[PDB]
């Protein structure tokens, strides 16, 4: 479910999730789900110098060890808004993934966001 490879002037390498629209941002890429959906997924992947906050939740991701956080905001009739923030060590630096979608069925898996982060390197 990934296709095109994408490379940033800052050295970040990721794949464009299939069915998504890619845009370059300050320190990475933004992906917005294709089409005109009621409730599209939005992802961002960025290179980051600054380390994550201490004590974030910890998860095994591929080789292992991402630290993440999930926040829940009031949304609308498609459900609350859920925001993932996740960081993986990238040498002495960090790669960060932010993801958003609504859900009326509790916290989303964010599988695609986790995948993107896993397949990210510099």
């Amino acid at each position: 479910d990934f296709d095109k490879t994408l490379t940033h002037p800052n050295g970040l390498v990721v794949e464009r999730p299939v069915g998504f629209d890619a845009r370059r941002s300050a320190e990475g890429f933004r992906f917005d789900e294709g089409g005109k959906l009621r409730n599209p997924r939005q992802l961002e992947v960025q290179r980051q110098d600054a380390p994550p906050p201490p004590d974030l939740a910890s998860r095994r991701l591929g080789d292992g060890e991402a630290r993440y956080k999930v926040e829940e905001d009031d949304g609308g009739s498609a459900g609350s808004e859920y925001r993932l923030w996740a960081a993986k060590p990238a040498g002495a630096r960090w790669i960060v993934v932010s993801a958003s979608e609504q859900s009326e069925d509790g916290e989303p898996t964010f599988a695609l966001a986790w995948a993107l982060l896993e397949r990210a390197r510099l």
């Binding site: 089409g35 009621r38 409730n39």
Partner: protein, 399 residues
């Protein structure tokens, strides 16, 4: 009164079996509902000690509901007496009304809810009976929810215990079964003729409300149309806008999602689902007191989260919650700073924030589209739903 005498008689004797009570109950109920001096009838039965007896021996919850809703609804200056007698009667058989669909309402709460509702309907203009309008026969796919069908979410069979666990585990095929039916919104609209659209609108709006308190009304339940129009008046909206919001939701709704919406909300998890006609989110109804104009504060302070979820499944409550929330989204919009909402500005160039504060009759079409986005999703965060604006706009056009 004539009715008190009549009821005094049916009470003149104990009752043999479950069936006698059944027919005698049914008969007292109709007498109450057809009685033209309901206050004086209650006063007469109170004096006799018969009021308490009435409540004590109308046993089966189903019948206690019809009785309690009718009396609470029809009475005014003597209603406190009926409440007093009911309370006294509960001391023995406390079960009262608190079963099945109504398990989250203590019996006295059920009385108070019926009382407030009856009062609000007369005061706000939606007491009048609706015509038996026709409902969709669908059980699957787009527009097979209560909006189309008239089948209350609360009446739907439990989702199999096994599948509930699969939902929790996010098993794709099962999640799909119980979620929004639609992906490509435009593609769905395309398969509809203008006549089909119009027929959905009529079906949606013309049928009686699916209410959990039918006997709180003087006659048959009102049409949804009547309730929406009353709500438009209360919140300075139009029934057409309210209609368009709900029609869009209801096209993106199935019988199965109704079942999920309600059951998950009242499960161990107390899920924060969007429920009923306008797909109001449980937490949103509580946080913004969306029932304020139908229910008095005392009742409102007593409701559990799950009682709130259940109310959202009652059409009038939902419609008023939806309308109140729309007015809230519009007011909040009128207070925004448009230069701080450039994506919104971009997608809806003719948007007029000031106009939002007033009646939709004066909104530019772009206000309707913007509000649509900001109804499915978080309001005025400058992050938009790409597809809902055109989806709602189309329904608006039909109205």
């Amino acid at each position: 009164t004539a009715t008190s005498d009549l009821i005094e008689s049916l009470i003149s004797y104990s009752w043999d079996d479950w069936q006698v009570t059944r027919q005698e109950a049914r008969r007292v109920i109709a007498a109450i509902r057809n009685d033209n001096v309901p206050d004086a009838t209650i006063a007469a039965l109170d004096k006799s000690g018969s009021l308490i007896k009435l409540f004590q021996r109308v046993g089966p919850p189903e019948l206690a509901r019809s009785l309690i809703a009718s009396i609470a609804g029809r009475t005014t200056m003597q209603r406190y007496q009926a409440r007093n007698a009911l309370i006294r009667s509960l001391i023995n058989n406390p079960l009262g009304t608190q079963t099945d669909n109504w398990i989250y309402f203590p019996t006295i709460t059920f009385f108070d809810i019926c009382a407030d509702l009856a009062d609000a309907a007369g005061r706000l203009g939606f007491a009048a009976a609706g015509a038996t309008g026709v409902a969709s026969q669908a059980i699957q796919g787009p527009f097979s929810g209560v909006g189309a069908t008239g089948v209350n979410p609360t009446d739907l069979p439990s989702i199999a215990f096994g599948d509930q666990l699969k939902l929790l585990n996010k098993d794709p095929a099962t999640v799909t079964k119980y979620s929004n039916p639609l992906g490509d919104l435009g593609a769905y609209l395309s398969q509809l003729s203008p006549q089909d659209k119009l027929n959905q609108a009529q079906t949606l709006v013309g049928q009686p409300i699916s209410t959990l308190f039918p006997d709180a009304y003087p006659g048959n339940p009102p049409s949804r149309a009547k309730v929406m129009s009353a709500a438009a008046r209360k919140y300075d909206l139009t029934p057409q806008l309210i209609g368009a919001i709900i029609l869009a939701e209801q096209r993106d709704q199935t019988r199965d999602e109704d079942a999920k919406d309600y059951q998950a909300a009242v499960s161990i998890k107390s899920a924060n689902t969007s429920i009923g006609l306008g797909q109001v989110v449980v937490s949103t109804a509580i946080k913004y007191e969306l029932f304020t104009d139908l229910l008095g504060q005392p009742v409102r302070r007593g409701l559990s989260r799950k009682a709130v979820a259940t109310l959202l499944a009652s059409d009038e409550f939902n419609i008023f919650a939806t309308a109140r929330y729309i007015r809230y989204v519009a007011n909040l919009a009128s207070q925004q700073d448009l230069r701080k909402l450039p994506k919104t500005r971009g997608a809806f160039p003719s948007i007029d924030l000031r106009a939002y504060a007033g009646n939709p009759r004066n909104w530019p079409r772009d206000n309707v589209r913007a509000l649509a986005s900001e109804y499915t999703s978080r309001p005025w965060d400058d992050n938009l739903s790409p597809g809902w604006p055109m989806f709602v706009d189309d329904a608006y056009a039909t109205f």
